[PDB]
């Protein structure tokens, strides 16, 4: 294109001139540049386990059975013992009897199943999930033994413990995933923020010694005259917890050392290449010393990180995510290895190759989650979200050479997972910002940008509610990462989030609006009463009546949402203890408590998904039905029940009604109230297990497509089964004609009672691949920061490339797009989601847009 | 007719129909995706019973992931 | 049996997981993707598998 | 004899003149006078299950299996459910599947085993006790099924839960029952004070309705917007507890009604006598309405009382005792039936016959306790101790016609159990007092006397320490009964003691003094180190050094005792819930808590047994070893190791040293310091689970025989294996040579830091059985009350009748004697205990003795 | 074949513990002390024992 | 005359008439064979009733009257 700006003629020609000789519909097939030949071979040989539409993309991926079998064995043997010690014994049995895997060209080693094409299962979490796996084509084998395991675990499963405290009608409404996401105890889905810092600094031997010292001190206190029954009995649970930590840590050390032994055996007996043999011996020594001893170099740190990830996200319990401050966590070891060359001496490109291998190992991590969460992350194994950038405790820029290494590896290897979040501050140096823009302009979809000051202030605010008064300090508040996709949380040796029961889960306003217009009866999907009987159409005489009906629906739904999580946490700390995670947490170790019992930092939240559809529907109802009396509510209900068939003129009238993201005063006025007074305002009144408030972390993450299919037609003009809004604050597909700046100003208006909101923006490809684009992108980020919007993520892919990919998937396998909250391989996304992504407006910048953005060419 | 109906022990269950995908939470339930609007919407219907339910549009098989949501 | 296999590597005496007669069964396996190795804990007295190679 | 008193001539000739025509060696065989022929038939055919030396006296008594069988089934089926609901389900299964028993001539019906000659066992409490039962001749059958049941229960037993938290050496020291009684979790022994008042006043249907109302309110609170995670989760345990209460109460109602149905069936199909048929129909209707509905008459009250006792002491859990304020509890229904004749009209003699039948039913109650407690209550089924007399809330006399009926039934029917405790006050009317003296003069040993004011002040003082501020009020403090033998505790609808973990268990000073003289090494019994190494003999240079060595031993032992009890309570409330007891407690029902969790009234205590042996030994050590330096500590130790062989002169010198109970200033000074500074002083430093102090309740209860047989020779003059003192404060047998008044003054000297001290005294037969008996006994009790002595109990038996019963046991079946805190059939006591009882000094009253007592003829 | 015993007394339908086919088996016994009666819950179709009285 | 350990003795302490099982642990025992002339029954503790014997071993069992 060509833009006239302040007299200058801006030519949007790709920086690399050779890009003029590459066709536009295959561009992304020529952008990957693996740093070494080893990472190229690894990218070609990668065992991707992406999942979509509830099934796995590849026929080679199948569930394992070793974890179920060994956990069941240990549980049958540990009857009568303290539940924490029983959990430690279960983890120990799984780790001691599991098959270990070593693949060719690997440097970071380790796996979470008995075979590199498999993934573990979790019969202790949700028996319905294992039952769904048994009925699936990728079931664990032998099938009868897995069925016996599930039948044994059903009475002890977390689902069976949590369900007796709720109306079966409520749970039936929840499990439909239409107006409310199913509770985590019914699905087994979870998240965690592991304290990698403790593992990397201390080593597990130190944690064992600490737990043993505490045990001896407690036993001596129990034998101290004179005994005090009102204080001494507190030592029983502490001793149980500390013994569980010792068992789990000894098991993990033995497990890592057996992996190193496998490395040495393959070096001495199976491998022919002497270079490969020497490398295997080096890895074997690493796994020998790590994680028993503190980390001394960067390779030590990365191997320890991967071991801790395997235990905290796959083996001890299932937990989605990849939460960590990778650059801050790895910087001391980068300085030891690359800068100072004191232990494991390497160059910067060596660290780049190491991060490449880390990304590929994560790309091979199959997640044994339930069907619901094999549906809502199309085109990816799971959610893997790390955080870099930000500010330190003294408010100075936290960017370093390790951030640049991570970003360069992510740009070179072009893998969808793990996704990256960059906490942006004005303090952030321009070199790292150029690397972030390098990743974004290549269409990877990451790093997403988050407002650093907003997150730090949020951490400070939540810390005030701490039950033991040990919330994050003002200095600790700067050390935060995204828990899964969008919600900030503390990272470090202490006070990190340990379960999704603390925060997470979704509520869907679109279905709530639909049933508000039908007295709480979901006729479109389940033909059943999905909500309270807020009133028939004759009762909704004023717009305020519809507003209050939605308020009642929202209150009922969100109350169930948070209460299920708190009950899940109650039973998690009593029967689903994580002694290993508790061992590497300084607070759990000091207090002798389980990771789920102790909660020094509140972070309660819930995700409103499909908010903008309901908001636009409300704006259209107020505009046409009530204010202008052009259509009656009964006419609208008759048309909606008809799926707009024979009412097409009315459907277009409602579609053209004022919409979010056009800087429209009418639509934005109502929708800002909807966000702050209802979506955030009513949810804020709820208090969670930690004593903090629950605030909305708006996002969509694929559910927007699944919920929309389950949702019926809406006054917004959507037909039934049409996809909902892509992002929580994002404008709906093809509803924005005023350009990017107008969308930014609409997003700017909602500043109250939101813990986070997700904005998805599609930027023009020519401007981005042009030299002018980094300056435009920096200007947008600076305006967005001054606007105080919480988050922004960018997709830069031509429709032509995507349409070609739909027609020829094998040709377009390299291309990566961004769905909301994460990045996916386009060819692995179903046509439904691909079309929702294609229909996102590719935003072009005018002269007035740049003038608003304060661009200086 | 084309809408689902109950048939005790039917030879053509929703379970074996290509338009069905198991429920996200309860594998005993299902989602019927046979009502595909011309504008792309997949207007799913909920299925309480996948073993004793059928309609006229029953087709044995299984769609690829591209044809599901 | 299952002792003179070329894939039978006795666990060293000093290992954290050492027991009397325990060993690693280490195999090399290869599919369309690549070549990998599997190490499962077995014992000197154990059942042999379909592929027994004499050491 | 004939004693001249102040010039008047007192001749001690029996009131009954036929006693001059009865020879003195068979007297007590001709005193029983059953009120009706039915109770006479019941007395002749009574199925006594007396126990001695750890075995059962009769070969017809054998263990049952139904309780073990059905409890095991219910526990296997209830896995995964809340532990309280699991306990309720176990009780429900036992009650629903149990065989019910009806015997001839019974009016109060009901049993706790499948056969009238059998008793239940408790595999959930202590697996060692069940193992001991399996190796016994009275083992449950079939033996292999019982062994499999014990193998199933071992990992889940309470003993297995408590043992991991103590040094195995410490537990090994306790389990010998030599210096410290074994902890209750190791034996299964227990006690309880049931809230009979709630059952008799409300009926279980009201409790079920109340629990269901609470459940509904809690669930509605859990679904109330907005949810509060710091408050709503408190409802989970409450709902679990209330549902368990509903299950248990419905089971008990169904069980009682099935018993009534058995009565009706036997009336309609098996019985020929029309009088018996009508009686059976009456009992059947009673069991239909009782305990589902409130009691309306005296028969209702007695049947309900017996059912509640069966559940609280045998079926739901083992619990020794018969704790209740029987006259106060039964008075409203006696007044309804006998005085006002409003429902179930009866005469006073009818109530006497009813209490007779109750006493015989208790005499048929076999206790499935462990071997240790089949050893230490020789000559009785178990401990059954009820309390009558006392004062009401206003401080007025609590004696009534029901008290006299109970005492009259105890007088005519001559059964050892239940024993009676009479709380004495100056307010007590003279009519009841003679009924008390009527029982005592017959040699029954009961009613025992307790100081009312001391108990009431004790309840107030303990109430001050209540954790939730709901201790007994000053009015409630007057309503107290003995828990087992000697310790006061609140009775009523609320705040009653629910487990022996609150108070109970024993510690033995004699063995402690022995090991103090041997550096903590028990050479005499076990040849093992039983206590801390306080010092060798050369280190004990001062008498104060010996004192301090004993203090260190005592501190170690008492700390172990109280800590074992509190750990037992922790695991009782977590895995041994008693939902039925919780249902009939107003506090547990109101708060939705288990009977073991809630402790609104502290009552902590421990029993020092064999105190006077240690006290006299210390007095003799100071006398001869230090003050007179006649023997060295090494000479004394050499004599002890030789069992005084060749040291007889030294043995007589130590025996002739000043002893307790002779009003010796030297001995009483040292022993009073011993009681107040060490026995009470060190124990109160310890605080129990309820937050109250732990105070000594001195008593022997037969343990004195066993511990003496396990104790080596002592400086008091004992040979190895000889029995110790028979009470908490009683003088050692045959060591009091100054008459009863000197014993009274000595006992009165001890006033600080005690919760109770048992006093055994033997009064002369002619004086008590003469027409002057009451006046002398009343003067004795009046002076004893003015001397502020805690307790006294009497034996009225001549040595000749006891020797004749030893020679001709088959002709003295009705001879009843008093041991310590309980009464036993003399012929069922082993020769060892019989000889200890015979050797007690039969005291006689001089002129000066009566003058001290203010006897006015 | 546990239904036409003379000791088979069906539980009334109005009883709290009533189940389909449940009944009380009430027998009489006597030893050296006295005579008693035992009521055990059994079912309509159940195993008969040695003491089956006809009708 | 003192108790000694004999593996699998033909006459264990368990079957001796002078022995009564331990009050807490049936694997232990109480030897009541040292009866003083003055009435004392000086019991001695037995760690193992299965592999122990002395010269005074007499198979049988006293009545309760002869025990403590
Ligand atoms: O756990 C969740 O549901 C979402 C987390 C996030 O988006 O941070
Ligand atoms: O339970 C005990 O050891 C004693 C109780 C009492 O004497 O009340
Ligand atoms: S049989 Fe009919 S109702 Fe059932 S899944 Fe197939 S199309 Fe849907
Ligand atoms: S399992 Fe097979 S490969 Fe492994 S050691 Fe045994 S015979 Fe060899
Ligand atoms: S159990 Fe025996 S006695 Fe009872 S009803 Fe059946 S056959 Fe008759
Ligand atoms: S064999 Fe000897 S030591 Fe053993 S119980 Fe008999 S007398 Fe005692």
Numbering used by the authors:
A (entry chain D), D (entry chain A): 9 to 865
B (entry chain E): 13 to 81
C (entry chain F), E (entry chain C): 5 to 59
F (entry chain B): 14 to 81
Study authors write:
X-succinate synthases (XSSs) are a class of glycyl radical enzymes (GREs) that enable anaerobic hydrocarbon functionalization, granting anaerobes access to petroleum-derived substrates for metabolism. Among them, BSS stands out for its ability to catalyze the stereoselective hydroalkylation of fumarate with toluene, making it a compelling candidate for biocatalytic C–C bond formation. The most well-studied XSS, benzylsuccinate synthase (BSS), includes two [4Fe–4S] cluster-binding accessory subunits, BSSγ and BSSβ. Within canonical GREs, the glycyl radical (Gly·) is generated on the conserved Gly by an activating enzyme (AE) and subsequently transferred to Cys, forming a thiyl radical (Cys·) that initiates substrate activation.
The structure of BSS­(αβγ)2 has been previously solved; however, in all reported structures, the N-terminus, C-terminus, and [4Fe–4S] cluster of the γ subunit are unresolved. , We modified the protein purification protocol and used previously established crystallization conditions to obtain a structure of the full BSS­(αβγ)2 complex to 2.9 Å resolution. Notably, our purification approach allowed us to resolve the majority of the BSSγ subunit (residues 5–59 out of 60), and we observed clear density for the [4Fe–4S] cluster known to bind this subunit. , Based on prior modeling and cyclic voltammetry experiments, BSSγ was proposed to adopt a high potential iron-sulfur protein (HiPIP) fold; our structure confirms this proposed architecture (overlay of β and γ). We also observe clear density for BSSβ (residues 13–81 out of 81) and its associated [4Fe–4S] cluster. It has previously been proposed that a loop within BSSβ controls hydrocarbon access to the active site while the C-terminus controls conformational changes of the GRD that could be associated with formation of the thiyl radical and/or activation by AE. ,, The catalytic BSSα subunit adopts the characteristic 10-stranded β/α-barrel and exhibits high structural similarity to previously reported structures (R.M.S.D. = 0.183, residues 9–865 out of 865). In the active site, both toluene and fumarate were modeled and align well with prior structures; however, only fumarate was intentionally included in the crystallization conditions. The remaining electron density in the toluene-binding pocket was too large to model as water, and toluene provided the best fit. Although toluene was not added to the crystallization conditions, it is present in the atmosphere of our anaerobic chamber and binds the BSSαβγ complex with high affinity. , Consistent with its strong binding, we observe benzylsuccinate formation in control reactions lacking added toluene, provided that all other components are present. Structurally, BSSγ resembles BSSβ (blue), with both adopting HiPIP-like folds. The C-terminus of BSSβ is the only region that directly contacts the glycyl radical domain (GRD), suggesting a potential role in modulating conformational dynamics of the GRD and thus thiyl radical formation.
